[PDB]
Structure formats: structure tokens, C-alpha cells
């Protein structure tokens, strides 16, 4: 029979029955499952330092953002984008393709087709659950202990005064694997006093760090998470690797580039492109490997499309159509925010709406 996996170290966010205000630091803010008091109650240490108990039965206060730090895996599978094998964490199987799967990073990282509906397979024992397309679903940004975060020592600290002392600060440079069997479970810190090291952020449910300034950890499809209880690359890795022959090559530190937008910090002598990512990493590519787009900027004034057929198509295709939007057609408005799924929050007619970026034009 199916049973709950009491996965200590799972990275979680607030769930559908959440009623505890801003205890997590806000929606999309991340925490670590420290332990289970029972099969109904779980202890979470949020990245902001707050420890609290939550319901994981009948009522569900939490969603799983990443279970990979627990080591749970799906032997006999491979992620067809990044080639992780076995898939560690939640398994995401494309329902519309033959024998195609993604890991959680590639799934939330918008790899494969966003209009193809996936199955969520949370555990090896889970029945597969058909989801809505990512293209039509709400995407938010994770916040907490991620690259760029400003941190102090956390509750489970046992590393002497490596930080220079309790309350001394440092910056997370990179989320790493504490061990091969527990990915995404550690954070490398550069302490302000020049010291540096790797600390547990999820490994064995440990919280060595607490951010005083949380950072963005990339975006995810919130309602696709199971309840508990510049330039981008859109080309298949085998392509990338052989294209990289004589243009910087490939190393296993570059997988960030497959799902994370990087910025062109330069152009070298062999006409290859140097690219910097929020990790702090620089990487060099054959220009073929890279593709650029995302047009608009915050504060841009734009005109809403005035072809109703087209704007209906555009809004529906992106899961954001409402008849109430009719008075915005042809109106000029201001880009308030560029969402992670490329849609736009636009101030128009004294309200805000979410628009497909093709549904507006720079004025
Ligand atoms: Zn993957
Ligand atoms: Zn597919």
C-alpha cells in the first residue's frame, strides 16, 4: 500500500490550507523540514529563522518545492533535458510524449514544451497525477537562502566561529550538494570577514543558516507542487556539448545555464561569448548555443493590442483572459513587473492586469 514518506530535509513553501500570515516570510518563501513530530505534524525552520509546527494531514500547510535534499529518487529514470540519472526528488513525466521525463529543476525551469501537460510523480509509490500545462499555470519566485542571500548562522550551526562570530554576516554564492545522494542541500558562503565554507541548508533537515536578506531562487509552478503529507539556452545538451568543442567546452558547473538566464559580460578574441550568471560564474559559448529575447523593462509604457480576436487568443493561450479586460483594448499603460513566465503586470485604466507580452507594444 501507499504510505507517507517522512522526508526530513525537504524544501517547502506555504500550502493550500495556510492561515498563518507571514510566518514563512511571505508566499514563495522557502523553509526546511526539520523533523516530524507525528504523521500529522511537521516542524519547519524557515529560511528567515522562524521555527514552527504545521499540519500535514487533512489540513495541509505546506507544499514541497524540492524533495531532492531528502535523497528520495526514482531508480530506472533519467531527466531527458539535464540527464540526471536517477531523477532525484519529484519525478515529472510528460503525458503528451513517449517516454519523456524531467527533474524538478528542468520542470520548474521551463524545459521541454510548456504546452505539454505533465504527470507529477512525487514518490516511487505515487500514482501519477495529470496537471495543467505550465503555459497556463501560475508561476511565482522562490525566496530565501539562494545565491546572493545575506545570511547569519542558523539554529543547527556547529562550526565554531567560522563566520567570525554569532551574528556576523556573509553572502551565499551558490546552492550546492552536501553529498552526491543529497543535492541542492547546501549553501556555499563567503563570510564578510573573508572566511568561507559550505553549510547545510536542508541536508538531514539541518538549518546552518538564516538569511537576514533573502534572495530569489528561481521560479516555480506553485499549484503543481505536491502538498506535504540576457541569454537562455533552449537546446538539447548533446547539441550544446558538441557545439562547445573549441568554444570553452562543457563542465558540470554549467548546468545552471540550461534553466537560468545569464548575461553577456563579454565577447572574446575567437568571437565566442562570455556569459555571467547570478551564481557569480562566467562561462564561454559558441554563439550558436545562445538565444536571446525578453524585450520589455519595468516602467516601459505599452499599448494594449486592440485586435480582440488576437488578444483573446494571446490571453487564453497563457491562461490570463477575462472579459473584464475589454476596456483595456488599445489603452496605454505601464509595465509594473515582468513575471518569471514572461507575462507582464501592466497598470492600465487605474487597475493592473496580467498580459501575454505579445498582447502589448512599446509606445
Ligand atoms: Zn533535469
Ligand atoms: Zn512532451
Q: How many angstroms is it from 91 CA to the middle of ligand 2?
A: 14
Q: How many angstroms is it from 342 CA to the middle of ligand 1?
A: 21
Q: Is 225 among the annotated ligand-binding positions?
A: no
Q: Is 349 among the annotated ligand-binding positions?
A: no
CA-CA distance, 105 to 218, in Å (whole number)?
Answer: 10
Q: How many angstroms is it from 103 CA to the middle of ligand 2?
A: 14
Q: How many angstroms is it from 85 CA to the middle of ligand 1?
A: 9
- Identify which of 109, 92, 27 has the alpha carbon closest to the alpha carbon of residue 61: 27
Q: How many angstroms is it from 86 CA to the middle of ligand 2?
A: 19
Q: Is 82 among the annotated ligand-binding positions?
A: yes
Q: Is 305 among the annotated ligand-binding positions?
A: no
CA atoms lying within 13 Å on the CB side of residue 354? 17
Please name which ligand lies nearest the alpha carbon of 117: 2
Contact between 242 and 285 (Cβ < 8 Å): no
Q: Is 112 among the annotated ligand-binding positions?
A: yes
Please name which ligand lies nearest the alpha carbon of 100: 2
- Mapped to the 3 state alphabet, what secondary structure does the chain carry? CCCCCCCCCCEEEECCCCCCCCCCCCCCECEEEEEECCCCEEEEEECCCCEEEEEEECEECEEEEECHHHCCEECCCCCCCCCCCCEECCEEEECCCCCCEECHHHHHCCCCCCCCCEEEECCCCCCCEECCCHHHCCEEEEEECCCCCEEEECCCCCCCCCCCCCCCCEEEEEEECCECCECCCEEEEEECCCCEEEEEECHHHCECEEEEECEEEEEEEHHHCCECCCEECCCCHHHHHHHCCCCCCCCHHHCHHHHCCEEEEEECCCCCEEEECCCCCEEEECHHHCECCCCCCCCCEEEECCCHHHHHHHHHHCCCCCHHHHHHCCCEEEEEEECCCCCEEEEECCEEEEECHHHEEEC
Q: C-alpha distances in angstroms, 211 versus 11, 66, 340, 342?
A: 15, 19, 23, 28
Phi, psi of 301 (to 5 degrees): -90, 135
Q: How many angstroms is it from 157 CA to the middle of ligand 1?
A: 31
Q: Is 79 among the annotated ligand-binding positions?
A: yes
| CATH number of domain containing 152 | 2.30.30.40
Exposure string for 96-135, b = 16+ CB within 10 A, e = fewer: eeeebbbbbbbbbbbbbebeebbbbbbbeebeeeebebbb
Contact between 35 and 8 (Cβ < 8 Å): yes
Domain region containing 215 = 142-220
By DSSP bridging, strand 332-338 and strand 301-304 are antiparallel
Q: How many angstroms is it from 18 CA to the middle of ligand 1?
A: 30
CA-CA distance, 56 to 34, in Å (whole number)?
Answer: 14
Q: Is 56 among the annotated ligand-binding positions?
A: no
Q: Is 97 among the annotated ligand-binding positions?
A: yes
- Identify which of 236, 290, 292, 283 has the alpha carbon closest to the alpha carbon of residue 102: 236
Contact between 22 and 66 (Cβ < 8 Å): no
Amino acid at each position: 500500500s501507499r504510505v507517507m514518506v517522512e522526508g526530513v530535509g525537504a524544501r517547502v513553501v506555504r500550502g493550500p490550507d495556510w492561515k498563518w500570515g507571514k510566518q514563512d516570510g511571505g508566499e514563495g518563501h522557502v523553509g526546511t523540514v526539520r523533523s516530524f513530530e507525528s504523521p500529522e505534524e511537521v516542524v519547519v525552520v524557515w529560511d528567515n529563522g522562524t521555527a514552527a509546527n504545521y499540519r500535514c494531514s487533512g489540513a495541509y500547510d505546506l507544499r514541497i518545492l524540492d524533495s531532492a535534499p531528502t535523497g528520495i529518487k526514482h531508480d530506472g529514470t533519467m531527466c531527458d533535458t539535464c540527464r540526471q540519472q536517477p531523477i532525484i526528488g519529484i519525478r515529472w513525466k510528460c503525458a503528451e510524449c513517449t517516454n519523456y521525463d524531467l527533474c524538478t529543476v528542468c520542470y520548474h525551469g521551463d524545459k521541454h514544451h510548456l504546452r505539454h501537460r505533465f504527470y507529477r510523480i512525487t514518490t516511487p509509490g505515487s500514482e501519477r497525477v495529470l496537471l495543467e500545462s505550465r503555459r497556463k499555470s501560475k508561476k511565482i519566485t522562490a525566496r530565501g537562502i539562494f545565491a546572493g542571500a545575506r545570511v547569519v548562522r542558523g539554529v543547527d550551526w556547529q562550526w565554531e566561529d567560522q563566520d567570525g562570530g554569532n551574528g556576523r554576516r556573509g553572502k551565499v554564492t551558490e546552492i550546492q550538494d552536501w553529498s552526491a545522494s543529497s543535492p541542492h542541500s547546501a549553501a556555499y558562503v563567503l563570510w564578510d570577514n573573508g572566511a568561507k565554507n559550505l553549510y547545510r541548508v536542508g541536508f538531514e533537515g539541518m538549518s546552518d543558516l538564516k538569511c537576514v536578506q533573502d534572495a530569489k531562487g528561481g521560479s516555480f509552478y506553485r499549484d503543481h507542487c505536491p502538498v506535504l503529507g540576457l541569454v537562455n539556452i533552449d537546446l538539447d545538451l548533446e547539441i550544446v556539448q558538441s557545439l562547445q568543442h573549441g568554444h570553452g567546452g562543457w563542465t558540470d558547473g554549467m548546468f545552471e545555464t540550461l534553466t537560468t538566464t545569464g548575461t553577456v559580460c563579454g565577447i572574446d578574441e575567437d568571437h565566442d561569448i562570455v556569459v555571467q550568471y547570478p551564481s557569480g560564474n562566467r562561462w564561454t559559448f559558441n554563439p550558436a548555443v545562445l538565444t536571446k529575447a525578453s524585450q520589455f523593462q519595468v516602467g516601459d509604457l505599452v499599448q494594449v493590442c486592440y485586435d480582440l480576436e488576437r488578444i483573446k487568443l494571446l490571453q487564453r493561450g497563457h491562461g490570463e483572459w477575462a472579459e473584464a479586460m475589454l476596456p483595456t483594448l488599445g489603452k496605454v499603460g505601464r509595465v509594473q513587473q515582468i513575471y518569471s513566465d514572461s507575462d507582464l503586470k501592466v497598470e492600465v485604466c487605474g487597475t493592473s492586469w496580467t498580459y501575454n507580452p505579445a498582447a502589448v507594444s512599446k509606445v
